[PDB]
Every structure is written in structure tokens, then in C-alpha cells.
Amino acid sequence: ADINHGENVFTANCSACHAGGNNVIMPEKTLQKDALSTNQMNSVGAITYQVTNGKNAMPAFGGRLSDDDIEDVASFVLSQSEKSWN
Numbered sequence: 605a606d607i608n609h610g611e612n613v614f615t616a617n618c619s620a621c622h623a624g625g626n627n628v629i630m631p632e633k634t635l636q637k638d639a640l641s642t643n644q645m646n647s648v649g650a651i652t653y654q655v656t657n658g659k660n661a662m663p664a665f666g667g668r669l670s671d672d673d674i675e676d677v678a679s680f681v682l683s684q685s686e687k688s689w690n
């Protein structure tokens with residue numbers, strides 16, 4: 605995956621709700637390892653699915669982003685999670 609491009613996809617599409625790895629609408633559902641794991645979201649496959657299809661109050665991005673875009677942003681999320689979004 606292209607993590608640098610994933611970072612840019614994140615700025616363009618995700619930072620509004622998830623800047624710093626937090627979650628503006630559902631604060632407990634962060635992009636940190638503990639919350640991801642609790643929610644069966646600590647994987648590229650789980651993140652790609654949720655980004656593509658949406659979940660609850662998170663909108664879907666399948667029509668907006670290419671498959672490569674989504675793979676890249678999911679990989680970026682996991683990379684940041686590993687560094688606690690520091």
C-alpha cells in the first residue's frame with residue numbers, strides 16, 4: 605500500500621471526524637489500537653469494509669474513493685494506530 609497517499613486520502617475525507625485518531629460523533633470509537641481491537645476493526649479488511657460501506661452514523665465512501673484509495677487509507681490508519689497517532 606501507499607501510506608503517503610493514504611495520509612492524503614485521510615486529510616481529504618476523514619480528518620473532519622477523526623483528526624488525531626479521535627472520533628467526533630462517537631468519542632469511544634477511536635482509531636487507537638484498543639478501541640479498534642474491541643470493535644473487530646484492527647485489520648485492513650475490516651477498515652476497508654467500513655470505509656466502503658459505512659457503518660451506523662459513519663457515511664460510506666465506496667462511491668467517492670477508488671479501491672486503491674481505500675486500501676491506502678486503511679493502511680495509513682493502522683500505521684498511525686501503531687504510533688498512537690503521535
Ligand code: HEM
Pocket residue numbers: 613614617618619620621622627629630632633634635636639640643645651654655659660661662663665677678681
Ligand atoms: C475516511 C475515509 C474515514 C476513515 C478511514 C474512517 C475510519 C473509521 C474506523 C477505522 C472506525 C472504527 C473505529 C472503532 O474504534 O471502532 C470508524 C468509526 C466511525 N467513524 Fe469513521 N472513518 C472515516 C470517515 C468518517 C467521517 C468523515 C465521519 C464523520 C462524519 C466518521 C464517523 C465515524 C463514526 C460515527 C464511527 C463509529 C461507527 C459505529 O460503530 O457506530 N468517519 N471510522
